Structures are given as C-alpha cells and as structure tokens.
C-alpha cells in the first residue's frame, strides 16, 4: 500500500 501510494502521488 505504501509503495502504491507513493507512486500514484
Ligand atoms: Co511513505
């Protein structure tokens, strides 16, 4: 979830 969110960011 993390590495999603600070890819989409
Ligand atoms: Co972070």
């Given at each position: 979830?993390?590495?999603?969110l600070?890819?989409a960011?």
């Open positions: 979830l993390a590495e999603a600070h890819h960011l």
